[PDB]
């Protein structure tokens, strides 16, 4: 239901997934040639089949493929700086693929929104879903849009006619947690006759 979910969520409202007490088979993921990009930092995805983690987490959203390269520790992404901050010492894997067939409409699909304004970058894995009208200066907006009174969000529109640099991409990022606690995820490789 993470990779074959029919709809995803917007980047400002990125869902928060917990994986524990189950066996993770990443071979189903990296063997399939249906994902545009496959980046893992500080960890070997092939060797993930015989390692254990205290807790494994996933995040899913849809953004532009050109914005994907922004997501990296030590780097700043225009969306990422206000939608998804990532620690420098992060360890995990990032996978993304195009969704032109399912996330593009001839008339456009404007239902997906995104955070646009804030006065400081958020902390790693910190979300902001407040709908309060952004203030561009000293004069209070008082909840009425207009000059210097900007709605905090805006939308994305996508069409099949959009090019490769314009098509939406479905993004999945995996984060692994290893506290001073027993692990909850194991691998099935050692099964034999």
């Amino acid at each position: 239901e993470v990779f074959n979910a029919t709809r995803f969520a917007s980047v400002y409202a990125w869902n928060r997934k917990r994986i524990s007490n189950c066996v993770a088979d990443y071979s189903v993921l990296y063997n399939s040639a249906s994902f545009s990009t496959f980046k893992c930092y500080g960890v070997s995805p092939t060797k993930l089949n015989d390692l254990c983690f205290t807790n494994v987490y996933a995040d899913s959203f849809v953004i532009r493929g050109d914005e994907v390269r922004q997501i990296a520790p030590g780097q700043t992404g225009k969306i990422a700086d206000y939608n998804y901050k990532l620690p420098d010492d992060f360890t995990g894997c990032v996978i993304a693929w195009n969704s032109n067939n399912l996330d593009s409409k001839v008339g456009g699909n404007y239902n997906y929104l995104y955070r646009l304004f804030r006065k400081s970058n958020l902390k790693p894995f910190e979300r902001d879903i407040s709908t309060e009208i952004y203030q561009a200066g000293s004069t209070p907006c008082n909840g009425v849009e207009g000059f210097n009174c900007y709605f905090p969000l805006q939308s994305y529109g996508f069409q099949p006619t959009n090019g490769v640099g314009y098509q939406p991409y479905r993004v999945v990022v995996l984060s692994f947690e290893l506290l001073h606690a027993p692990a909850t995820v194991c691998g099935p490789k050692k099964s034999t006759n």
Epitope: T76, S120, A136, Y150, G157, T161
Partner: antibody, heavy 117, light 109 residues
Framework: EVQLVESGGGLIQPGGSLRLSCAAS????????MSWVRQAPGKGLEWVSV???????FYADSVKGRFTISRDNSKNTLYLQMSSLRVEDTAVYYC???????????WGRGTTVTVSS | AIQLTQSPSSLSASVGDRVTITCRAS??????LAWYQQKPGKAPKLLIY???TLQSGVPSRFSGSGSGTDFTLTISSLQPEDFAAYYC??????????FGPGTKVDIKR
């Protein structure tokens, strides 16, 4: 009113190092996004850089090892320090303010620097 | 990268004459270009949002359209001060945003 107050440069040989500035007389600088402009005479206007409310910086290809931009909120002032100038760098340069990412609001009158013999 | 050309490179119109300026793209953008007005010795000025969204304080005589790659501008009733030059600017992505040839629109009185 809304207006931009710009520092002003001068005549400098190639490779010179200088710092400029621009204060926003319309709105508090910390509450908005802004930039500067490069305009080669009779050619056009080029994006160069921008600072973010989180302090983030972002350069153009030609200004990565050449230009640096800073801010003082108390002075309502956005700065710019240049280095490693070239002769062709002689061109009128303007200032950009972005009430929105997707456009432009108020142009500065521009500051000029000459690099010639 | 996206390459742009503005048509035409000069134009001849009278007072109130319908002036239509068009730019073309090589790649498919949806709503991320800007039409701007810049008189000589004068600063550029915001004209449109998206393709057909009016800005603040602009007379309704100014008009524009265009999507996909072919990108247009329109003046419903030409006005004497409209003697200027028109160009384009994209949104985000690379800094340069190259455009087409220079243009001179001439008023007929």
């Amino acid at each position: 009113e809304v207006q931009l107050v710009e520092s002003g440069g001068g005549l400098i040989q190639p490779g010179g190092s200088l710092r400029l500035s621009c204060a926003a007389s319309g709105i508090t600088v910390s509450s908005n996004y802004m930039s500067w402009v490069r305009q080669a005479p009779g050619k056009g206007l080029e994006w160069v850089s921008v600072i973010y409310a989180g302090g983030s910086t972002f350069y153009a290809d030609s200004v990565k090892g050449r230009f640096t931009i800073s801010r003082d909120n108390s002075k309502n002032t956005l700065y710019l320090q240049m280095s490693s100038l070239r002769v062709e760098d002689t061109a009128v340069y303007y200032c950009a303010r972005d009430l929105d990412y997707y456009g432009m609001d108020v142009w500065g009158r521009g500051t000029t620097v000459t690099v010639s013999s | 990268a996206i390459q742009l050309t503005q048509s035409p490179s000069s134009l001849s119109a009278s007072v109130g004459d319908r002036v239509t300026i068009t730019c073309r793209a090589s790649q498919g953008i949806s709503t991320y270009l800007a039409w701007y007005q810049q008189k000589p010795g004068k600063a550029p000025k915001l004209l449109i949002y998206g393709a057909s969204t009016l800005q603040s304080g602009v007379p309704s005589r100014f008009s524009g359209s265009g999507s996909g790659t072919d990108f247009t501008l329109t003046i419903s009733s030409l006005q004497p001060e409209d003697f200027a030059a028109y160009y384009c600017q994209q949104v985000n992505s690379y800094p340069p945003i190259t455009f087409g040839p220079g243009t001179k629109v001439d008023i007929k009185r």
